[PDB]
Structure 1
Amino acid sequence: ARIAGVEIPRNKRVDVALTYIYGIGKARAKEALEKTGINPATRVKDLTEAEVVRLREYVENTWKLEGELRAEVAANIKRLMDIGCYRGLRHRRGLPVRGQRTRTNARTRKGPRKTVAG
């Protein structure tokens, strides 16, 4: 049961294995199947072997290719520092950039308990 994307979640429900394809999520794997007529409680393995291959072109029409928008994750950070703004070194110093507290909670983009001397 080949998929529209690249990483195969090994023969699960059509709400599950079709979802975590890049470019697809809950509100795209939920509405992309009810238009085509597939019952969302069925398996990807128990799909029709023609529905294996003809549900692939519908995903690759509009949004930009897998890895390219993931490169736009790093490229939007580049274009926001068009003059080298302060938000650029808000990003490139390893911290959340919304404005969370960073002594306690929001320990994510910081390295977890990495560097202190005392």
Structure 2
Amino acid sequence: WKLEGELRAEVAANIKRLMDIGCYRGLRHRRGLPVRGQRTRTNARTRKGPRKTVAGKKKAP
């Protein structure tokens, strides 16, 4: 079997290929979003990473 570095390289070439053509799958790898149809309104933390909290919308008084 092909292993370690060589396998990693071959995995890398595959992702690289998707980006360069570049299919929707390739676009997702560009922005580091999920690739397999998961929702992104919530969760997706594994791909997106730690929460970058942001101000919300204020309420009236």
Both structures adopt the same fold (TM-score exceeding 0.5)? yes
Closer/same/farther in 2, CA of residues 117 and 82 from structure 1, 3 Å limit: same
Across the aligned residues of Structure 1 and Structure 2, the Cα RMSD in angstroms comes to 2.1
1:90 and 1:97 in contact (8 A); partners too: yes
**In structure 2, how many angstroms separate the alpha carbons of the residues matched to 1:71 and 1:113?**
30
Kept in 2, the 8 Å contact 1:94–1:111? The answer is: no
Q: Deviations over 1:21-60 (max 9, x none)?
A: xxxxxxxxxxxxxxxxxxxxxxxxxxxxxxxxxxxxxxxx
Report the TM-score when normalising by structure 2. Answer: 0.65
Query: Residue 95 of structure 1 contacts residue 108 of structure 1 at CA under 8 Å; is this kept in 2?
Result: no
Q: Is the 8 A contact 2:29 2:35 kept in 1?
A: yes
Identity fraction in percent: 100
In the TM superposition, residue 82 of structure 1 has moved relative to its aligned partner by: 5.3
Unaligned runs of 5+ in 2: 57-61
Higher helix share: 2
For residue 112 of structure 1, report the CA deviation from its aligned partner.
1.3
Q: Separation in 1 of the partners of 2:20 and 2:4?
A: 25
Distance 2:49 2:16 in 1: 22
Gapped runs of 5+ residues in structure 1?
Answer: 1-62
Counterparts in 2 of 1:64 and 1:95: CA distance versus 1, 3 Å: same
The alignment's TM-score, normalised by the length of structure 1, stands at: 0.39
Relative to structure 1, is the Cα distance of residues 90 and 82 closer, same or farther in structure 2, using a 3 angstrom cutoff? Answer: same
Quote the Cα distance in structure 1 between the aligned partners of 2:41 and 2:48.
10
1-side partners of 2:25 and 2:13: how far apart?
Answer: 14
Go from structure 1 to structure 2 and tell me whether the alpha carbon gap of 1:105 and 1:117 turns closer, same or farther (over 3 Å shift).
same
Report how many residues are paired.
Answer: 56
